[PDB]
Amino acid sequence: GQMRLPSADVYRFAEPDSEENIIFEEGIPIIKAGTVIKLIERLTYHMYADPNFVRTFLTTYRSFCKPQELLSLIIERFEIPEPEPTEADRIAIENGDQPLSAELKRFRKEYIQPVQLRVLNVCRHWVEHHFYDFERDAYLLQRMEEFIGTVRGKAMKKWVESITKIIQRKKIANITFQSSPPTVEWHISRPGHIETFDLLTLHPIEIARQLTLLESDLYRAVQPSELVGSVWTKEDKEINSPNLLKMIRHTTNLTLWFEKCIVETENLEERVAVVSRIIEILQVFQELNNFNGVLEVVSAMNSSPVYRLDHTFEQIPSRQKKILEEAHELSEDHYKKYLAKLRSINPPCVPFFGIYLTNILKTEEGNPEVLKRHGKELINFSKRRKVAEITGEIQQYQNQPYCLRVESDIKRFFENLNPMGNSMEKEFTDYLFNKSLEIEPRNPKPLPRFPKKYSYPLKSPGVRPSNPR
Amino acid sequence: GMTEYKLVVVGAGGVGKSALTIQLIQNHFVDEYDPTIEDSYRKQVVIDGETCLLDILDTAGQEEYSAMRDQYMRTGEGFLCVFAINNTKSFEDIHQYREQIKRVKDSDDVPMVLVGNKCDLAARTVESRQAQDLARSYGIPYIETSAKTRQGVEDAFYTLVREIRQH
Amino acid sequence: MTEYKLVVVGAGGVGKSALTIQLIQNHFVDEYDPTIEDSYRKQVVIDGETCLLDILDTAGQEEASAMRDQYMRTGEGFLCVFAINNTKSFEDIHQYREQIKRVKDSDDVPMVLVGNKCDLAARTVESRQAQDLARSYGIPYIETSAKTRQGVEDAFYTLVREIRQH
Ligand SMILES: Nc1nc2c(ncn2[C@@H]2O[C@H](COP(=O)(O)OP(=O)(O)NP(=O)(O)O)[C@@H](O)[C@H]2O)c(=O)[nH]1
Numbered sequence A: 001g002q003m004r005l006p007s008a009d010v011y012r013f014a015e016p017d018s019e020e021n022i023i024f025e026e027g028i029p030i031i032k033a034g035t036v037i038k039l040i041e042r043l044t045y046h047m048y049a050d051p052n053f054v055r056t057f058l059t060t061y062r063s064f065c066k067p068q069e070l071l072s073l074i075i076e077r078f079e080i081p082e083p084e085p086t087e088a089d090r091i092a093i094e095n096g097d098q099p100l101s102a103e104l105k106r107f108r109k110e111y112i113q114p115v116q117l118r119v120l121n122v123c124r125h126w127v128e129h130h131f132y133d134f135e136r137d138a139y140l141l142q143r144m145e146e147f148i149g150t151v152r153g154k155a156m157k158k159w160v161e162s163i164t165k166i167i168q169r170k171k172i173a174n175i176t177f178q179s180s181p182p183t184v185e186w187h188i189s190r191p192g193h194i195e196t197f198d199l200l201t202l203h204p205i206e207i208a209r210q211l212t213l214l215e216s217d218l219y220r221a222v223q224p225s226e227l228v229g230s231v232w233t234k235e236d237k238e239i240n241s242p243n244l245l246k247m248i249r250h251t252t253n254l255t256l257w258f259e260k261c262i263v264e265t266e267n268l269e270e271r272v273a274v275v276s277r278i279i280e281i282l283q284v285f286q287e288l289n290n291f292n293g294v295l296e297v298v299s300a301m302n303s304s305p306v307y308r309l310d311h312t313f314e315q316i317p318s319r320q321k322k323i324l325e326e327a328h329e330l331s332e333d334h335y336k337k338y339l340a341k342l343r344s345i346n347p348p349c350v351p352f353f354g355i356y357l358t359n360i361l362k363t364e365e366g367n368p369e370v371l372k373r374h375g376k377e378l379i380n381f382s383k384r385r386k387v388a389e390i391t392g393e394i395q396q397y398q399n400q401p402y403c404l405r406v407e408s409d410i411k412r413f414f415e416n417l418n419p420m421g422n423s424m425e426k427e428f429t430d431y432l433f434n435k436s437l438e439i440e441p442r443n444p445k446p447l448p449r450f451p452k453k454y455s456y457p458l459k460s461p462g463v464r465p466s467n468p469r
Numbered sequence B: 001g002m003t004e005y006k007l008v009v010v011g012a013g014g015v016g017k018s019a020l021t022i023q024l025i026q027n028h029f030v031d032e033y034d035p036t037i038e039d040s041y042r043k044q045v046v047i048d049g050e051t052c053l054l055d056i057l058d059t060a061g062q063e064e065y066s067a068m069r070d071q072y073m074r075t076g077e078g079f080l081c082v083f084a085i086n087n088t089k090s091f092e093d094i095h096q097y098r099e100q101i102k103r104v105k106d107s108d109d110v111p112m113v114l115v116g117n118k119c120d121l122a123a124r125t126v127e128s129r130q131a132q133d134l135a136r137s138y139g140i141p142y143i144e145t146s147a148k149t150r151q152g153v154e155d156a157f158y159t160l161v162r163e164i165r166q167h
Numbered sequence C: 001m002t003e004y005k006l007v008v009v010g011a012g013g014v015g016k017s018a019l020t021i022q023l024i025q026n027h028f029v030d031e032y033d034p035t036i037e038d039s040y041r042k043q044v045v046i047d048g049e050t051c052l053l054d055i056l057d058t059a060g061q062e063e064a065s066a067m068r069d070q071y072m073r074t075g076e077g078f079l080c081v082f083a084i085n086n087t088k089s090f091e092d093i094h095q096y097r098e099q100i101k102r103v104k105d106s107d108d109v110p111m112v113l114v115g116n117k118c119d120l121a122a123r124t125v126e127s128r129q130a131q132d133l134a135r136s137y138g139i140p141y142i143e144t145s146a147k148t149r150q151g152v153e154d155a156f157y158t159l160v161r162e163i164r165q166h
């Protein structure tokens, strides 16, 4: 038969399942809704482990339970009473013999030890992957240290001592590759001559590589804490989502820089060379699976100042028109082709983050926090699972590093790019549009001629890499 | 076959804008949503006895990608310009959204509706009359909606379709 | 995208976690933090086909030895890991092999035998002895180093091919 359980009066996690406290979806069960007590029971269940559930729960629980309360509940879960001796044990003891204690030994082996180990696994995952709770609440960290540091008994000892050390390391807190990265490529600007760095003087291959390293690092820095609760949209977004906002602001700045390079090149022939170079950079972004970079370029080419430049468009080579068209088609029909391509490539890649943001926000906004059943309010856990499916996808693409060498001067050049200067956004984008009208006026105004501004060769070195010995 | 209308929702972030399309497209009567499922943003409707397909673009959450606005707006035939009735800044943002739409579409007469959205029980700071006056100065309809009761939601989208049909 | 459920099993300290983290993050973990149960995901193209690997990293410490049926039921294929400088971990392999067969009620479970820590000179399990065992199981034997990456992709992606051809 099944093991007997402690009385629900002394141990709250032994209450029977009912539709008043847990609802399952239609081979482990998937929880649709439940009380916090039932969620924590299933988080630390004696019959099976559920590492996905641990990640989902630790990512999303603050929408229904405070960190201090979670710790109290898992400590309560850990403190399981042992059963009293059975009749057979009693009779042995009365005869001066040692009891077999068969039921007690089974309950220790099959209930207490798995539940306690799974509580410790929650603690371990909490500290390793969601340490911000403890960074933001020093008293919570003290309580966790005290709980772990006072667990007795040899069965848990290896993990107790390990978790103690992990906590201490987290308080005061290297890549290997299958091959060598390719050689850094140089064009007109030579190494160390940062004052000449520009769109046409850096090698287009190396522009795309260094922007991909930068954008990959920005992508990889975004933690789920910046996303759950839609906090990047709220009044404290600069406090709660700084890495996400830094990533988005880089993307915006690069798009505006591409637009500024185009419309400030007043000579038609030179502006064609600028646009052609940008589409070559886009080609390398595609080769590197840097989808953020691909869309940075597409957004610039679809912007109001650039889109209308028909005289420039007319001179772009047909093959480059095709490259830009197939990049734009990734975004059509609500990113249908982008989503399929992301799911087919071999990482490393740099996803476009905006789709994730919209899907997290709409999942949060479009589903209720609780479900009302039989007069009880149950936590709607399916909504949280959906959010954590998105944060899990994000994290999956954050693991793989690019095998490309950093060029510190090129990296600094793009880190410090500031196309808007001291201008406000409206002032600057009006300026870009007025430049567009200046260099290619609306019909029937005649097309003016403008002097060249670049003194160096406009011919691209191309985007196929070179390899000396 | 039936006409498809590409509608675009624009407006300030962080003030419940997304509830407009969610409530429309929703199982009206089951408060639930998976935005990831292909065609959680397409809805077949009958407006004045004529069946059509609404394809709604709502990039709520991407407001900080400000250089993508042109790219997203370019896809649309008609626009819902949404502000929150308890957020005066979102109302003051409307003028620049409208100017940007006119620029992207290269037209002074783009089908659009002004939508005042009640997203919580916090005190209203934009009165109906202020928003009506603004809409009239633009020559466009004004619809107020609730983010919780679905009131006004069908009126907002159907009014926009009528603006497109009568353009 | 086909999804593959891989499970990494073997005695405590043989490098199951270091192997997995090397595969996932290209990083070698120097610390020995005993696992309870961890899970990872990896999108990767193998033989021209994109798939999604779900990798379960399990507990090798004997104190967790009564909690294995539950993960063996879910797994499609198993990396059976020992360390080539630890003869006891090699002797523990057959206990994992037999338990997997019992739980899945099958003589034909996708498996790869992995001899880890092959960067270390002081070997105590000879390749021939491990290869003989692998042949008796009908499975390949791959020596790996979580430290240097030697053989790591080969071990995991060979297991994927086994599941695919099962
Ligand atoms: N030299 C060398 N050391 C390794 C290698 N793989 C793991 N180690 C080291 O061996 C120790 C144990 O590694 P770990 O991955 O934690 O082993 P495990 O099998 O997951 N242990 P457990 O079963 O307790 O979870 C660590 O100190 C780790 O750095 C390897 O290939 N070479």
Ligand SMILES: Cc1cc(Cn2c(N3CCNCC3)nc3ccc(Cl)cc32)cc(C)c1F
Residues within 6 Å of the ligand: A275, A298, A299, A301, A302, A306, A307, A308, A309, A310, A312, A313, A316, A320, A321, A324, A325, A328
């Ligand atoms: C190659 C190129 C395209 C465009 C702008 N553009 C165009 N236009 C529309 C208006 N007439 C000319 C074609 N179609 C595009 C499709 C996708 C994208 Cl992303 C941008 C698109 C503008 C410049 C200066 C240019 F060189």
Ligand SMILES: [Mg+2]
Residues within 6 Å of the ligand: C016, C017, C018, C033, C034, C035, C057, C058, C060
């Ligand atoms: Mg381990």
Ligand code: NA
Residues within 6 Å of the ligand: B086, B087, B088, B089, B125
């Ligand atoms: Na206000």
